[PDB]
Design a protein around this ligand. Structure first.
Ligand SMILES: [Mg+2]
Ligand SMILES: [Mg+2]
Ligand SMILES: [Mg+2]
Ligand SMILES: [Mg+2]
Ligand SMILES: [Mg+2]
Ligand SMILES: [Mg+2]
Ligand SMILES: [Mg+2]
Ligand SMILES: [Mg+2]
Ligand SMILES: [Mg+2]
Ligand SMILES: [Mg+2]
Ligand SMILES: [Mg+2]
Ligand SMILES: [Mg+2]
Ligand SMILES: [Mg+2]
Ligand SMILES: [Mg+2]
Ligand SMILES: [Mg+2]
Ligand SMILES: [Mg+2]
Ligand SMILES: [Mg+2]
Ligand SMILES: [Mg+2]
Ligand SMILES: [Mg+2]
Ligand SMILES: [Mg+2]
Ligand SMILES: [Mg+2]
Lengths: 180, 118, 196, 350, 147, 104, 126
RNA sequence: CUGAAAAUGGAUGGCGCUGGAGCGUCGGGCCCAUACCCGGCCGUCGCCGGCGCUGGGCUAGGCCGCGACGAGUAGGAGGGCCGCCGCGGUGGGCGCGGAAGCCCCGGGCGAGGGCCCGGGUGGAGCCGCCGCGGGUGCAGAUCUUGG
RNA sequence: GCCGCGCCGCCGAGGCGGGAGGGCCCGCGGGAGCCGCCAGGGGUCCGCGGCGAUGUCGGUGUCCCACCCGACCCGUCUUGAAACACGGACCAAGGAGUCUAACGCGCGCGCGAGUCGGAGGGACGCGAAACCCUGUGGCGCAAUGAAGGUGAGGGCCGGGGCGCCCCGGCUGAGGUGGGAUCCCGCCGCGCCGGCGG
RNA sequence: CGCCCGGGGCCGAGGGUCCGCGGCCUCCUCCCC
RNA sequence: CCGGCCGGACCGGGCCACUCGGCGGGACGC
C-alpha cells in the first residue's frame, strides 16, 4: 500500500520515429550513436527532432533562413534544419548559404547551389560536425498553420480573436447574432 | 549499402522462416542460419559460406569476391577442403583470419564446418 | 574523521553528565537542550486519509505504512508532526538507532533510484562538495544536525522498516493513553529495535 | 535533399548466347534513386485496388416479404413474422439480420469506394524505387528469383530479341542467360489454390518469374507469351504491380538494349529532367551515404566519441555491515580499530 | 481496412463502448442542427457566433464574373516574368524598363504588400492600390492602366 | 462581498479610485480579477511593508558585513529547540501542587 | 541427444485456466473468456472462485517454451527446413509436421540423425 | 434483581461456560491478511541507461544493466508469432506412402487468446511467412432456424 | 541580570608547556614485490549412499475418486441482486457499430507557393489495370466592410525641422524579458569542468 | 552491530575488483620432530 | 605505380534538323 498516483507515470514522448522510412531510420541509427557517445547537446536535440512528426517539423522558407543567417556572428556557420527548406520567391539574393536539411525543394536547391552555397545531409553533418560545431540549428514556424488559428478560448467569448469553423465565408455565414 | 539493403530484407524475405517464436534464414551463405544483420549471407560485400561438398566427404568454403558484386555468375569463389578434421578447421581459420575476411564469422564458420564433417 | 566522531560521540554525552551533576550538586536543575533530531515512523495505512494529513505525510516522504525519515525539529516541523499524530509514531532517536538504520536499512537516492549503500564512493560523489566523504560523515550529519542535514537526509531513502516484532499496543490511540501514535520521547528507540 | 551524382558503373549488353556482345551501356540514374519500400507498398496497395469489380447484395434480399410483428402478448420475441397460412414459412422472422432468410446487417452497397487515386509524383516515385531495387543482387535473391548464375544483375540483352517470333527462341535465350532455373521454379510452384477461389476461376496458382522489359514489340510479346512466369512490360509503360508483385520490390527483370537506353530519358538524371515526361525528375536523397558502419568508423567521428563503457555493472547483494565484518570495515576503516580496542578492554576489565 | 477498426477491440465488451447507464439510443438530442436555440444554444453561441439572424443587403442574381478581380502583391510581381528579364535589366538601370503585364498573367489589381527590387519597371494592370503605385514610382517605375 | 478581506496589487490608478488584481479561486482555476474600487475600501498591506523593510536591512547588513569582512545571517529560521540551561531554585523548594477535591 | 543445458524449469501454475461456468454448460467451452459481468464473482476475484489468467503467471524467460527434455520445439516440413537447425542443435529440436506423408518422414528422420538434431516424433507413421 | 407482554421452534454465532468461557482494571505469551520486511519470477514504467570497439555477441524494431511500480466498472489507448474468410506475393511449401473436417482416460507448449504433435476416422485438397480486403470471433436479445 | 578577579567543586568536558620514572598504545616508519589466506563485486563440493525388464521408475496438469479448506446463478437495469427482480430447459448453425457523402484533429506519404486531372483526350487473358497529356477548375497565396469599396515594411545612419515628422543614404520586420542550440574569452585539468559575455 | 559464541527454518537469483589479513622480501632462539 | 571507364551547380576550346525561354545572342545537352 504505497500512496503514489500512476496517472502520469508513463511519459508521453516519441522514443522512435513513427515513420517507416528507411533513410530516416538510418539517420536515427546514426544519431542514436552520436547522442549516446558524444556529450554534445546538439546531437541530443537533432535526435529528438528526427522523431517528431511533420507538423512538428515545419518548412523553413529561404527568406527566414537568410534572415537568421545574416545575423551577427553567423557568417561561416552551417544552417541545420531538421525538416524541409522551401524556396521563398519574394527574395532575390542568396548569401552563399551552407545548409543541412532532410528535404530541399527543387526551387530552393536551384538557388542555394547557384549562389555558390553548399547543401549537406545529416550523414555528412555527422562527419563535418560530429558535436555540431559552428552549426545554427533553425526551426520552421510551428504555430503558423491554419489549424492553430481555430485554437483558443472559443469564438463565442469576449476577447477571443479565435477563428470559427465555417463551411463558407460570406455575409450570411455566422455574422448576425453574437457579432453585433 | 548493406544497412540500406538490411532495412528491406529485415522482415520481408523469401528466406525468412518465422515460426515457434524463432526466425531462421534459408539463404546459402548464412553460417548460423540466423536472420540477423551480421550473419545475413547476401547483404555484405564479404560473405563466408561453409557448404558440404558435392560428394559425401569434404566442405566447401564459399567466399565473395571483391569485384564480383553485381555479376552473380562470377561473384563467389568456392574452396573445396577435403582433409582431416583438425586440418580442415585450420584451413578455414587461415582463410578468415589471415585475409582479414569477416573475422567476426571466424568461429561461426569453424563450428559450421565441424558440424558438416559429422 | 571516524576516530574523531568516535571520540566526539562520547564527549557529547559526558558533557551533559558533568553539567547535570553540576546542577544537582548545587541543588539547581540542568534542563538539557530540546532534541533537534526526530525519527518519524508512519503506522497507519493509505485508506481513508484526510487531504491535509495526506499532504504532510508526503512532505515527510512517508507514503506507505512502516517507513521512517529523520526530521530536523523546529517550529515549522513540529506543527507538521502535530497535523499527522494519529498516522505517525515519532520520537528522539539515539546514536545506535541512527547507525543501525543507515547501516542495515540505509539506501541512497542517486537519480530517484533506490541504490543500496555498499561503498563510500556513492556518498562522496554526491555529498563531497559538503564535506561528506564516508558513511560516518553521513551519520555524523544526521545524528548531530549539521549545516548540510537537509541534503544529507534527503540523500537517504526512506527506511522501509518491517512490522514491529512483538506487536504494537494500540495503533489507533496516542502513546500517552496506552497506544502507539504520537510522540514517544526516548521510547522510539525500543520501537526501532523491533522494526529495524 | 541531395542527389547521387556519383560515378555509375558501365552495364554490359549480352548477346543471345549469354556472353558479352562488346557493347556497353552506362547504368541509368534511375537505378540510384531512393529505394522506398513504404512508398512502393503504399502505391501498390492502392493501385491493386483499381482493377477490382464491384460486388453487392441485391436490394430486395430479405425484404420481398410482407412480415408483420405479432406485437407483445403472444409469448413470441416481437420479431416481424411471416403472415399465416398452410406453409412452414408462416410465423418466422423475415427482416432482422439474426433471422434465417432475412436481410444481412448493412447490405453491401455497389457505390462502395473501390478505387483509390494516387498522386502522379508518388506513382512515379514507387517505380523509381522498384527499378532501383531490381539492380541489387540481394533484393532479387531475397525475392526468391534464381539469379545465382545470371551474367549480370541488370540483365540487358541486345535488341535482336525484340524480333523473336517463336517460343523456342525465347526458351533458348533463357537457357543461355542461366535464367531458366527461375522458370523451372515457376513450374515447381504450379499448384492448386486453397479456398473458394477454385470456384471463382482461380484454381491454379504459381509464382512470378523474370520480367522481360522491351522498347519495341516486333514479336517479342508472342515469343515470351507462352512461357509461364514471364511478364512483358513495355519500357514506356511500366506497371508497379508487375515490377513489385505483392508490394515487395526486387523482381528479376531482363532488360533490352533499346529499353535500357530509353530508361534514362523516361525519368532523367538529377542533372537533366525527363525528356519523355512533362516536368518530372528523380526524387532526391535525404542520406547520401547509407553505409552506417563506414560513417561511424570514420576518424572524424571517432575523435568526438568518449570511451566505450564496455563494463557491465550488476546489482549487489548489500550484505549487512552490522553483521558482516569485511563489509563494515569497507565503509568504516576505524571499525576494525574500535572492535579491537573493545575486545582488549573487555579482557582487561575481566 | 477493417482490421484496424475500433469495433475489432470491442468484441466481447457488452456496451460496445457506449456505456451501460446511458445506452446508445437513436437520437437522444434531435437530428442535425436541432435545438440550436433551445437545448443547443450554449454550444451554438459559444462556437458558432452570428449564426442566427439576418445581416446585410440581398443580391438576387449574383454573377461572380463581374466582381472577378484577382490581386497580386509587389513581393511576387516579378514572378510574372522570367528571371533573365529582371537580371538583364538590373545591369542597365538607366536604360529601358521591362513591361510586366499583370492582366495577361491573370491579375487585374496590383497591391503593395511587399517591397520591390531597386530597378524601374513598367507595370500594366487594371487597378492599382495607392501604396502599390507609390512603391513603383519611388523605385523608378510607372503604372499603366489597362481597360 | 467575495473580495472583502482579499488582497491584491494595484495596476491602475484613477481619481479617488484604483484597480486591483485580486486572485479568485472559482473551482480549480485561481483567476486574476481586475476590479475597480474606490480608496475608502482599501488599505496598505502591512505585510508587504514589513518585507520591504527586511530587504532594506538585508541589503544593509550584507553591505556592512562586507566592509568589515564578517559574515552575518539573513535567512529567517523557525523557532529552534531551546538550548540547554540551568534553572536556579533560589533556595526555596518548588511549590507542591495536587488536584483539588470536587465541590458541588 | 542431450541439450546444451537442462535447467530446472519452474512453472507457476500447471492447471488450465478454465472459463467461468464452463462445466455447467456444454455450450460454454473451456477456452478462457474474461468475465465482464457487473455482478460476476470471478471478475471481482472473490475468494474461492476460478482464477483469472493475468501477467505474473508468466514463466521464466530463460525456460519459456522449453520442452520437458530441455530443447525447444520447432516445426519442420522438409529437408531444407530441417537443415536450418544444423547449428544450435543443442537448443532446438525438430518436429515433423502432421500433413507430411510417411514416405517423406523417413527421409527427414534419417537426415536429422546425421545432423545430430533431435526429433520429437521420430517414429510417427512408419 | 424488580419494573420487563406476541404470536412456526431458536439463537452471547453454536456447544456450553459460574475458583469464570461473566463484568472492570492490567501483565506476559501466542494466532494470521492479497498489509509490512527479505528473496525468486512475470510485466509495466522510469533511467540526459549501456553496446556500431567483434567463447558468446549486435533479428540495433536487437541485446544488456539499474531502480521503482502492479485493484478496477463505465471508458480510453496500445500490443498480439490470438483466431476466421478472401487477394497480391513467397516458401523449388504439404498431400491417395492419405488433405480438410471430426473424435481422443495420447504427448506437449503459451500468463491468456490459442497452437503443435500422436492415434483413430475420413477420402482430396491444404498451409506457414510479408503485405492487402472484410458480410471476421457469441451464452444470453420472452434472439432466428433446426434438432 | 551582565563584566572583572579570587576561592572551591567538576571519571578524564578538557585543552596547552615542562618535569621522576613506570608501560599501554599508532592508517608513523610496509610496497609499481612475489606467495597464500579470506565475515571480501548472489553456490559450491577437486563429498556420498541406496534401487535395476514381467514388476518396478518418472510423468500421467486436462480420466475417476477420496478428504481438509474456500465456495449462493449467470447476464442485466440498479444507490443496492444469490434474490420472493427480469431473460435463460438443452445442443448446433445464424446473429448486432456497417457503408457513402461531408467536417474536425492527430498520424504517415508526395510535392511545395504552390498543389491535385477527381471531366475528357492520347498511347496500347490479366488490360474496366497500368502509362502519357490536358490546370478549365478546386483548395491555398489577402484581408476587411452591410455595401459602395479599399486593401497590409520594419530598422539603421546623416542632415534638417523642434512640437509630435520633411530629405538623403545603407539595408530588408522593430523593441523589452525568457529562450534549446551554436560562438568567444578566461581559469582549472587540444580534450574535460568553473563564470564572463 | 558492544564483546564473543551457538542453534532452527527458508534459498544460491546472477554467470567472459574493492576492503581486511598472513608468510617471504631481516638475523636468530624455543616448542613440536 | 599504374591505365581505362563513369558521373558533374567543372574549366577552356570546336560542332549539332538540337532544344530553351513575355531576351542573332543567353542558357540547356549531343
Ligand atoms: Mg479505516
Ligand atoms: Mg478510525
Ligand atoms: Mg417488403
Ligand atoms: Mg438471404
Ligand atoms: Mg477451409
Ligand atoms: Mg471494460
Ligand atoms: Mg446495453
Ligand atoms: Mg447519453
Ligand atoms: Mg448515435
Ligand atoms: Mg499450462
Ligand atoms: Mg455491482
Ligand atoms: Mg435485567
Ligand atoms: Mg522486495
Ligand atoms: Mg466472406
Ligand atoms: Mg457478423
Ligand atoms: Mg449459442
Ligand atoms: Mg427477497
Ligand atoms: Mg424489465
Ligand atoms: Mg423463464
Ligand atoms: Mg456461431
Ligand atoms: Mg528577444
Amino acid at each position: 500500500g504505497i500512496d503514489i498516483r500512476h496517472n502520469k507515470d508513463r511519459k508521453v514522448r516519441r522514443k522512435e520515429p513513427k515513420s517507416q522510412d528507411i533513410y530516416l531510420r538510418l539517420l536515427v541509427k546514426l544519431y542514436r550513436f552520436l547522442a549516446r557517445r558524444t556529450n554534445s547537446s546538439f546531437n541530443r536535440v537533432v535526435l529528438k527532432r528526427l522523431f517528431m512528426s511533420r507538423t512538428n517539423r515545419p518548412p523553413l522558407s529561404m527568406s527566414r533562413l537568410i534572415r537568421k543567417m545574416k545575423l551577427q556572428g553567423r557568417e561561416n556557420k552551417t544552417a541545420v534544419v531538421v525538416g524541409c527548406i522551401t524556396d521563398d520567391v519574394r527574395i532575390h539574393d542568396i548569401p552563399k548559404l551552407k545548409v543541412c536539411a532532410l528535404k530541399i525543394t527543387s526551387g530552393a536547391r536551384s538557388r542555394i547551389l547557384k549562389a555558390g552555397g553548399q547543401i549537406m545531409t545529416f550523414d555528412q553533418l555527422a562527419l563535418a560536425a560530429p558535436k555540431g560545431q559552428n552549426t545554427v540549428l533553425l526551426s520552421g514556424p510551428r504555430k503558423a498553420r491554419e489549424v492553430y488559428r481555430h485554437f483558443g478560448k472559443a469564438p463565442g467569448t469576449p476577447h477571443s480573436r479565435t477563428k470559427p469553423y465555417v463551411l463558407s465565408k460570406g455575409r450570411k455565414f455566422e455574422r448576425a447574432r453574437g457579432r453585433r | 549499402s548493406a544497412h540500406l539493403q538490411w532495412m528491406v530484407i529485415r522482415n520481408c524475405s523469401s528466406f525468412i522462416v518465422k515460426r515457434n517464436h524463432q526466425v531462421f534464414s534459408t539463404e546459402p551463405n548464412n553460417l548460423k542460419a540466423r536472420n540477423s544483420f551480421r550473419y545475413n549471407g547476401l547483404i555484405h560485400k564479404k560473405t563466408v559460406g561453409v557448404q558440404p561438398a558435392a560428394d559425401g566427404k569434404g566442405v566447401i568454403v564459399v567466399l565473395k569476391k571483391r569485384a564480383g558484386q553485381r555479376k552473380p555468375a562470377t561473384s563467389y569463389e568456392k574452396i573445396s577442403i577435403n582433409k582431416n578434421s583438425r586440418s580442415t578447421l585450420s584451413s578455414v581459420r587461415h582463410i578468415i583470419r589471415k585475409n582479414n575476411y569477416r573475422k567476426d564469422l571466424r568461429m561461426a564458420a569453424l563450428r559450421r564446418a565441424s558440424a558438416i564433417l559429422k | 574523521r571516524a576516530e574523531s566522531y568516535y571520540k566526539e560521540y562520547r564527549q557529547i554525552y559526558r558533557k551533559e553528565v558533568r553539567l547535570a551533576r553540576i546542577a544537582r550538586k548545587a541543588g539547581n536543575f540542568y534542563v538539557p537542550a530540546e532534541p533537534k533530531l526526530a525519527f518519524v515512523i508512519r503506522i497507519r495505512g493509505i485508506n481513508g486519509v484526510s487531504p491535509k494529513v495526506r499532504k504532510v505525510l508526503q512532505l515527510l516522504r512517508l507514503r506507505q505504512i512502516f517507513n521512517g525519515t529523520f526530521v530536523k525539529l523546529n517550529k515549522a516541523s513540529i506543527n507538521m508532526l502535530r497535523l499527522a499524530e494519529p498516522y505517525i509514531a515519532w520520537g528522539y532517536p539515539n546514536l545506535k538507532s541512527v547507525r543501525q538504520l543507515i547501516y542495515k536499512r540505509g539506501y541512497l537516492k542517486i537519480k530517484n533510484q533506490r541504490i543500496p549503500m555498499t561503498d563510500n564512493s556513492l556518498i562522496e560523489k554526491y555529498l563531497g562538495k559538503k564535506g561528506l566523504m564516508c558513511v560516518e560523515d553521513l551519520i555524523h550529519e544526521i545524528y548531530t544536525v549539521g549545516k548540510n542535514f537537509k541534503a544529507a537526509n534527503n540523500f537517504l531513502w526512506p527506511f522501509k522498516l518491517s512490522s514491529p516484532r512483538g506487536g504494537m499496543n494500540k495503533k489507533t490511540t496516542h502513546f500517552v493513553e496506552g497506544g502507539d501514535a504520537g510522540n514517544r520521547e526516548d521510547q522510539i528507540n525500543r520501537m526501532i529495535r523491533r522494526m529495524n | 535533399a541531395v542527389s547521387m551524382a556519383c560515378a555509375r558503373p558501365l552495364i554490359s549488353v549480352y548477346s543471345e548466347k549469354g556472353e558479352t556482345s562488346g557493347k556497353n551501356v552506362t547504368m541509368p540514374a534511375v537505378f540510384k534513386a531512393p529505394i522506398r519500400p513504404d512508398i512502393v507498398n503504399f502505391v501498390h496497395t492502392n493501385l491493386r485496388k483499381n482493377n477490382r469489380q464491384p460486388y453487392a447484395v441485391s436490394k430486395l434480399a430479405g425484404h420481398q416479404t410482407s412480415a408483420e410483428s405479432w406485437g407483445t402478448g403472444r409469448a413470441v420475441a416481437r420479431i416481424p413474422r411471416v403472415r399465416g397460412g398452410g406453409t412452414h414459412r408462416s410465423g418466422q422472422g423475415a427482416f432482422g439480420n439474426m433471422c434465417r432468410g432475412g436481410r444481412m446487417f448493412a447490405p453491401t452497397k455497389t457505390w462502395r469506394r473501390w478505387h483509390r487515386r494516387v498522386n502522379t509524383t508518388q506513382k512515379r516515385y514507387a517505380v523509381c524505387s522498384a527499378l532501383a531495387a531490381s539492380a541489387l543482387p540481394a533484393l532479387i535473391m531475397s525475392k526468391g528469383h534464381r539469379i545465382e548464375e545470371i551474367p549480370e544483375v541488370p540483365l540487358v540483352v541486345e535488341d535482336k530479341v525484340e524480333s523473336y517470333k517463336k517460343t523456342k527462341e525465347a526458351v533458348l535465350l533463357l537457357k543461355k542467360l542461366k535464367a531458366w532455373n527461375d522458370i523451372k521454379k515457376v513450374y515447381a510452384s504450379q499448384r492448386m489454390r486453397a479456398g473458394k477461389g477454385k470456384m471463382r476461376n482461380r484454381r491454379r496458382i504459381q509464382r512470378r518469374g523474370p520480367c522481360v522489359i522491351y522498347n519495341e514489340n516486333n514479336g517479342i510479346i508472342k515469343a515470351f507469351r507462352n512461357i509461364p512466369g514471364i511478364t512483358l512490360l513495355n519500357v514506356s509503360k511500366l506497371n508497379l504491380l508487375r515490377l513489385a508483385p505483392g508490394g515487395h520490390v526486387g523482381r528479376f527483370c531482363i532488360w533490352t538494349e533499346s529499353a535500357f537506353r530509353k530508361l534514362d530519358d523516361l525519368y532523367g538524371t538529377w542533372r537533366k529532367s525527363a525528356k519523355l515526361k512533362a516536368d518530372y525528375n528523380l526524387p532526391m536523397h535525404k542520406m547520401t551515404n547509407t553505409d552506417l558502419t563506414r560513417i561511424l568508423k570514420s576518424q572524424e567521428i571517432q575523435r568526438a566519441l568518449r570511451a566505450p563503457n564496455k563494463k557491465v555493472k550488476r546489482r549487489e547483494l548489500k550484505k549487512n555491515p552490522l553483521k558482516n565484518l569485511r563489509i563494515m570495515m569497507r565503509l568504516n576503516p576505524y571499525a576494525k580499530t574500535a572492535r579491537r580496542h573493545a575486545i582488549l578492554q573487555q579482557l582487561e576489565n575481566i | 481496412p477493417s482490421k484496424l477498426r475500433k469495433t475489432r477491440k470491442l468484441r466481447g465488451h457488452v456496451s460496445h463502448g457506449h456505456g451501460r447507464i446511458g445506452k446508445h439510443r437513436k437520437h437522444p438530442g434531435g437530428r442535425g442542427n436541432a435545438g440550436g436555440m433551445h437545448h443547443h444554444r450554449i454550444n451554438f453561441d459559444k462556437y458558432h457566433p452570428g449564426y442566427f439572424g439576418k445581416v446585410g443587403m440581398r443580391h438576387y442574381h449574383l454573377k461572380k464574373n463581374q466582381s472577378f478581380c484577382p490581386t497580386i502583391n509587389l513581393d511576387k510581381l516579378w514572378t510574372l516574368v522570367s528571371e533573365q528579364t529582371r537580371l538583364n535589366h538590373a545591369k542597365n538601370l538607366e536604360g529601358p524598363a521591362p513591361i510586366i503585364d499583370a492582366v495577361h498573367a491573370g491579375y487585374y489589381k496590383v497591391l503593395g504588400k511587399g517591397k520591390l527590387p531597386k530597378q524601374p519597371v513598367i507595370v500594366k494592370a487594371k487597378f492599382f492600390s495607392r501604396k502599390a503605385e507609390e512603391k513603383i514610382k519611388s523605385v523608378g517605375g510607372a503604372c499603366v492602366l489597362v481597360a | 462581498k467575495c473580495y472583502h478581506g482579499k488582497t491584491g496589487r494595484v495596476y491602475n490608478v484613477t481619481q479617488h479610485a484604483v484597480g486591483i488584481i485580486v486572485n479568485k479561486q472559482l473551482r480549480g482555476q485561481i483567476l486574476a480579477k481586475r476590479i475597480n474600487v474606490r480608496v475608502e475600501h482599501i488599505r496598505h498591506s502591512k505585510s508587504r511593508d514589513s518585507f520591504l523593510q527586511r530587504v532594506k536591512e538585508n541589503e544593509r547588513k550584507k553591505k556592512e558585513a562586507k566592509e568589515k569582512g564578517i559574515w552575518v545571517e539573513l535567512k529567517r529560521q523557525p523557532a529552534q529547540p531551546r538550548e540547554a540551561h540551568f534553572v536556579r531554585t533560589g533556595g526555596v523548594e518548588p511549590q507542591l501542587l495536587e488536584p483539588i477535591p470536587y465541590e458541588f | 541427444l542431450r541439450p546444451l543445458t537442462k535447467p530446472k524449469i519452474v512453472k507457476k501454475r500447471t492447471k488450465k485456466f478454465i472459463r467461468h461456468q464452463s462445466d455447467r454448460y456444454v455450450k460454454i467451452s473451456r477456452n478462457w473468456r474474461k468475465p465482464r459481468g457487473i455482478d460476476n464473482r470471478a471478475r471481482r476475484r472473490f475468494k474461492g472462485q476460478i482464477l483469472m489468467p493475468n501477467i505474473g503467471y508468466g514463466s521464466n524467460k530463460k525456460t519459456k517454451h522449453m520442452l520437458p527434455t530441455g530443447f525447444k520445439k520447432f516445426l519442420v516440413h522438409n529437408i531444407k527446413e530441417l537443415e536450418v537447425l544444423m547449428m544450435s542443435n543443442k537448443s532446438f529440436c525438430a518436429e515433423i509436421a502432421h500433413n507430411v506423408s510417411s514416405k517423406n518422414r523417413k527421409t527427414i528422420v534419417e537426415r536429422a540423425a546425421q545432423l545430430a538434431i533431435k526429433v520429437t516424433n521420430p517414429n510417427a507413421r512408419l
